[PDB]
Design a protein around this ligand. Structure first.
Ligand SMILES: O=C(O)C1=C[C@H](O)[C@@H](O)[C@H]([C@H](O)[C@H](O)CO)O1
Ligand code: NA
Length: 380
């Protein structure tokens, strides 16, 4: 029934890499080679908060990387145009460290933002060469050299953020080395609990709005990069990035536990992050899913709808190719979706200029797309 309406789509770069005109810089003068790893949420004011990793010197997952963000200037503009967005701010950039994997969730008048961190001397694989010629040590299980999990919060509609608090000791398993939270988004259940996807576990926030305490729900067979969603039937669903290239890994259950993860052959994935959004719970209930709908590459970005009460089946949906955007490099990769006040899907989508090929010098930017259901429904 939302298919009857006139299609609407609109798209433009929102985080502009250093190689692009009007590159995004902080008010301090700090600029960024690349922006990756988007997260976006609509607050209960209707203001949109967009988060990313500002990777300072190159496009690598490690090294000096700051967690940055923008807000819409007003809570009512819905990010309609470029000028509707504030200029870049910083959640956390302290030291030479990696701060990233933004994974926010809105809770009434509090926005919670989980993030991952590592020391600037360490990388996932280790032995990587830093700007100064120093080789990274490999992420390990020491306090110094593990991936930490941090939580920061805003009670002023994303304007300011409390000093990030290290929650690794309580919300990551003891002994763990590599870790990820999201990235993308957590969710607030119909029943009021907050759920944050993370590597091998959900992170559950309980208590009144804005005064939460968190615990781990350890999962069996989950991915490192998960999405969480409350399907129309009320159940939870993890839809995760696979280890190897092929297809999304999916599991369903409740706060008491999830069933086994199993590959969803309806959802090809190239071992890349995806995003998911419960769009509405009234009839017809809809779940939206975005990812690169390919087994081998990140450039087949597709958005889809499921009408299933457990989101078992997604339609073909529509290729983001159908509304391509010039002057932003080759679009595709990590994504994040939110619903806007004016009833569109707002998505951040990574794009890669690909100048040094897959080398570290290739600049990465992030696109902001909006589209209504009609635009998805009425594609080939
Ligand atoms: O572009 C990527 O593939 C990527 C970028 C992120 O910054 C990394 O944290 C993440 C990680 O390397 C994998 O999830 C395997 O742990 O992957
Ligand atoms: Na930094």
């Amino acid at each position: 029934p939302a298919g009857k309406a006139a299609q609407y789509h609109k798209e433009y770069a929102l985080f502009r890499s250093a190689n692009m005109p009007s590159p995004d810089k902080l008010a301090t003068g700090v600029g960024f080679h690349s922006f990756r790893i988007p997260a976006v949420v609509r607050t209960n004011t209707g203001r949109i908060l967009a988060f990313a990793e500002g990777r300072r010197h190159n496009n690598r997952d490690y090294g000096d990387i700051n967690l940055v963000y923008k807000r819409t200037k007003s809570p009512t503009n819905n990010g309609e145009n470029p000028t509707d967005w504030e200029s870049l701010r910083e959640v956390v950039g302290t030291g030479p460290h990696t701060w990233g994997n933004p994974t926010p969730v809105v809770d009434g008048n509090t926005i919670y933002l989980f993030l991952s961190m590592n020391d600037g001397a360490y990388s996932q694989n280790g032995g990587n060469t830093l700007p100064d010629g120093t080789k990274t040590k490999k992420i390990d299980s020491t306090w110094v050299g593990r991936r930490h999990l941090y939580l920061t919060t805003s009670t002023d509609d994303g304007d300011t953020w409390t000093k990030p608090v290290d929650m690794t000791k309580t919300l990551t398993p003891d002994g763990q080395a590599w870790d990820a939270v999201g990235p993308g988004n957590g969710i607030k259940l119909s029943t009021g609990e907050l759920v944050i996807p993370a590597q091998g576990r959900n992170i559950i926030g309980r208590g009144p709005s804005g005064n939460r305490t968190w615990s781990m729900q350890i999962l069996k067979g989950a991915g490192s990069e998960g999405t969480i969603c409350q399907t129309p039937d009320g159940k939870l669903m993890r839809n995760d990035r696979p280890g190897p290239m092929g297809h999304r890994s999916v599991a369903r259950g409740t706060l008491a536990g999830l069933g086994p993860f199993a590959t969803d052959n309806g959802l090809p994935d190239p071992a890349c992050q995806g995003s998911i959004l419960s769009y509405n719970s009234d009839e017809p209930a809809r779940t939206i899913f975005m990812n690169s709908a390919s087994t081998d590459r990140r450039t087949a970005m597709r958005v889809r709808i499921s009408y299933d009460k457990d989101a078992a089946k997604f339609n073909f949906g529509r290729e983001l190719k159908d509304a391509p955007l010039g002057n932003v490099g080759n679009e595709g990769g990590y994504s994040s979706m939110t619903k806007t006040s004016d009833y569109k899907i707002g998505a951040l989508v990574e794009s890669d200029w690909y100048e040094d090929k897959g080398g570290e010098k290739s600049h990465r930017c992030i696109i902001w797309r909006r589209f209504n259901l009609s635009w998805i429904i009425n594609g080939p």
